[PDB]
Structure 1
Amino acid sequence: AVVKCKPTSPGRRHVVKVVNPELHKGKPFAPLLEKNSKSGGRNNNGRITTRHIGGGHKQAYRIVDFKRNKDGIPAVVERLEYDPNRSANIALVLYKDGERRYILAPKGLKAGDQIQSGVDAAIKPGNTLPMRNIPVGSTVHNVEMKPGKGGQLARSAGTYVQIVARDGAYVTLRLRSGEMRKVEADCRATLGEVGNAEHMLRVLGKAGAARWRGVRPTVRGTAMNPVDHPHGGGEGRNFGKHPVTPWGVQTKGKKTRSNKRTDKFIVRRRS
């Protein structure tokens, strides 16, 4: 659910928190954590390659299974854990042989549910199987681009991929952006839609909330100096120029896609 926080003090007036009562409260599964280092937006050369990244609360990486390499084993969910590394929630599934792994929690998955990934993989929300055995027209998430790569499509919150047609050894997919893409049928994916979809309704209420998520304030170019930004500045607020990126690349319309290698896998762009 979504709760609008009462305006007890300025800065909490517009806060709209997202509450998940069934989300587990407590420490995660210790063996499935890895050390995460904040880069701060700096590469190995130490320069800020991408801006507005720095600070924020410390986070521990969760090993989320995207490949589903081991197949044909019944699985049961145990708990849902908050994952700071991604918008979507994660679920801790215990295999019938005693192995615990992390998977992306779909919308229809709650506590005390049973999933089955295998060659048969009866069509239920949460099952994992290749596209050759998935009916055309179902909501599918955690889609792959290559066989065995593991979960490279529709990983965010409330996102899904719809299958429109097969037409041979490939499969045509309607991506969430609105673009038709062709992938080989050997790619493995999961049925159902991904979990919590009310991620829009949270608005963070204040500047400080965005500060501890790792986002630094952004300086608009029109308030900068000509030596710093192409927009620069004059006496008062003056623009007089076409909007461009700080590196002199025209913005608001100029397409920057130049691949010429994956174009054959695309039959229709977004709109």
Structure 2
Amino acid sequence: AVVKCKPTSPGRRHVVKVVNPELHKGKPFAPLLEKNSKSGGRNNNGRITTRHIGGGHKQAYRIVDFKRNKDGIPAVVERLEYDPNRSANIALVLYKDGERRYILAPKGLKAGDQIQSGVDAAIKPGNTLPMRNIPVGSTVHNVEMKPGKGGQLARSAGTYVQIVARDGAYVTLRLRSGEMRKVEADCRATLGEVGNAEHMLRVLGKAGAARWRGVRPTVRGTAMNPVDHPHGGGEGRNFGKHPVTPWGVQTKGKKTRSNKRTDKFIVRRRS
């Protein structure tokens, strides 16, 4: 529910909250949780290797199942739980034999649905099955790149991936970025787009509402003095250069992909 707010104070005026009554208010499922540090955007050396990261609210990791090992066992969806790591909603699912797991929640998947994995599963939103059995021209998500490794593509909320063509050994996927790449046909994928499609409509209204997400303020390069940033300087609002990074690489259009190892698997780029 894209609910605009009433302007009873400054900052509250522009806020939009996506209230969902489908979520569960209670405490999450305990033994599938664990700790998760924040690390402040610093590596093991100690230096800050990623700026603006830090602060924020303390959050706990929910162990989610991407590989979908349980093939053939039917499973029932218990509830939906908010996850502060993903942008997408996750679902607690209970199996026919007793194991409880988490999955990424698809679009039309309310609590009370029936899903399973395996090759003989019906092509219905929620199941996961190897890509050589999914019909060409179908929307999937949680796509693995290597067989039984992951489930990597189409994980953020409201996304999907279109299967296009099958030439025997490989299958073409029109990705979310308008990019068609090929993958090994033995990988698995989960039908239907992922849920929480209205995540994009969150506007945050105030300045502190990005701080407790863990995102610190960013200082423009033209604000600093020229020993810091390669824009710098100024006797008052002077730029005069071409826009580069803080380390002197051009930022306003400069193709930085250099792999040559995965170029054999793609067809087009960002158009």
TM-score range, shorter chain: over 0.9
Shift of residue 70 of structure 1? 2.0
Partner Cα distance (1:166, 1:269) in 2 = 20
Q: Where do 5+ consecutive residues of structure 1 fail to align?
A: none
Percent identity between the aligned chains?
100
> CA deviation digits over 1:168-195, x for unaligned, max 9?
2000000000001000100101011100
Q: Return the offset for 1:200.
A: 1.4
Q: Secondary structure at the match of 1:149?
A: coil
Distance 1:186 1:169 in 2: 8
Question: How far does the alpha carbon of each residue in 1:70-97 deviate from its partner, in whole angstroms, 9 at most, with x for none?
Answer: 2111000001000000100000000010
Counterpart-to-counterpart distance in 2, 1:15 and 1:251: 31
Q: CA deviation at 1:46?
A: 0.6
Give CA-to-partner distance per residue, 1:77-129, whole Å, 9 cap, x none.
00100000010000000001010000000001001111121111100100000
Please give the alpha-carbon distance, in whole angstroms, between the structure 2 residues aligned to 1:166 and 1:185.
Answer: 8
Counterpart CA distance in 2 for 1:249 and 1:6 is: 44
Q: Which residue of 1 aligns with 2:51?
A: 51
What TM-score, normalized by structure 1, do the two folds share?
0.99
Shift of 1:233: 2.2
Distance 2:216 2:10 in 1: 21
Contact 1:126/1:190 (<8 A) preserved: yes
Deviations 1:207-246 (A, max 9, x none): 1110000100000001111000000121010000000000
In structure 2, the gaps of 5 or more residues are: none
Give the Cα separation in 1 of the matches to 2:202 and 2:70. 37
RMSD: 0.6
TM value normalised by structure 2: 0.99
Distance 2:200 2:206 in 1: 15
Report deviation, 1:34. 1.0
What's the CA shift string for 1:18-44, capped at 9, x where partnerless?
011010001100010011011100000
Post-superposition CA distance 1:43-85 (Å, at most 9, x none): 0011000000000000000001000012111000001000000
3-state secondary structure, aligned to 2:47: coil
Cα deviation per residue 1:1-24 (whole Å; 9 max; x = unaligned)? Answer: 111010010000000000110100
Counterpart secondary structure, 1:148: coil
- Could you list the structure 1 runs, at least 4 aligned residues long, displaced by more than 2 angstroms after superposition: none
Following the alignment from structure 1 to structure 2, what is the Cα–Cα distance between the partners of residues 22 and 201? Answer: 18
In structure 2, the residue corresponding to 1:30 is in which secondary structure? coil
Give the Cα–Cα distance (whole angstroms) in 2 for the partners of residues 130 and 252 of structure 1.
Answer: 41
**Cα distance in 2 between the residues matched to 1:18 and 1:169:** 42
